[PDB]
Amino acid sequence: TNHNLHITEKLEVLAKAYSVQGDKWRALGYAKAINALKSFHKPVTSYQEACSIPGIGKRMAEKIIEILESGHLRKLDHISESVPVLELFSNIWGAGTKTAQMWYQQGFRSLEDIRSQASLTTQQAIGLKHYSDFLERMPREEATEIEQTVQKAAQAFNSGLLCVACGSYRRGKATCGDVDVLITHPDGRSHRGIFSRLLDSLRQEGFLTDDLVKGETKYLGVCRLPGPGRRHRRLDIIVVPYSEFACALLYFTGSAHFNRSMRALAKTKGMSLSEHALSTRVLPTPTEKDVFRLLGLPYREPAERDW
DNA sequence: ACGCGGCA
DNA sequence: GCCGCGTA
Ligand SMILES: [Cl-]
Ligand code: NA
How many whole angstroms from A21 Cα to the centroid of ligand 2? Answer: 12
Experimentally, the structure was elucidated by X-ray
Strand B footprint nucleotides (protein C-beta < 7 Å): 1-6
Determine the residue type at A219: Y
A272 CB-to-strand B distance under 7 Å: no
CA A123 to C1' B5, in angstroms, rounded, equals 11
Return d(Cα A11, Cα A55) in angstroms, integer. Answer: 14
- Enter the resolution in angstroms: 2.0
Return d(Cα A175, Cα A159) in angstroms, integer. Answer: 29
A72 CB-to-strand B distance under 7 Å: no
- Pairing of the two strands A282-283 and A278-279: antiparallel
Return d(Cα A223, Cα A202) in angstroms, integer. Answer: 9
At A94 the three-state DSSP class reads coil
At A207 the three-state DSSP class reads coil
Cβ(A286)–Cβ(A246) under 8 Å?
A: yes
Domains of chain A listed by start with CATH number:
5-76 (1.10.150.110), 83-129 (1.10.150.20), 138-240 (3.30.460.10), 255-305 (3.30.210.10)
Return d(Cα A211, Cα A222) in angstroms, integer. Answer: 6
CA A260 to C1' C2, in angstroms, rounded, equals 29
Cβ(A217)–Cβ(A240) under 8 Å?
A: yes
CA proximity to A166, closest of A178, A150, A148, A155: A178
User: Is residue A110 reached through a cis peptide bond, with omega within 30 degrees of 0 on the bond before it?
Assistant: no
Q: After which residues is chain A broken (C to N over 2.5 A)?
A: 280
Return d(Cα A254, Cα A166) in angstroms, integer. Answer: 8
How many whole angstroms from A121 Cα to the centroid of ligand 1? Answer: 15
Residue A119 CA, chain-centre distance (Å), reads 27
CA A129 to C1' B7, in angstroms, rounded, equals 28
Return d(Cα A247, Cα A274) in angstroms, integer. Answer: 7
Instruction: Determine whether the annotation assigns residue A227 to a binding site.
Output: no
Return d(Cα A254, Cα A131) in angstroms, integer. Answer: 24
φ, ψ (nearest 5 deg) of residue A205: -90, 0
At A269 the three-state DSSP class reads coil
Instruction: Determine whether the annotation assigns residue A180 to a binding site.
Output: yes
- Pairing of the two strands A233-239 and A179-184: parallel
Enzyme catalytic residues of A: 63
A304, containing H or E segment: none
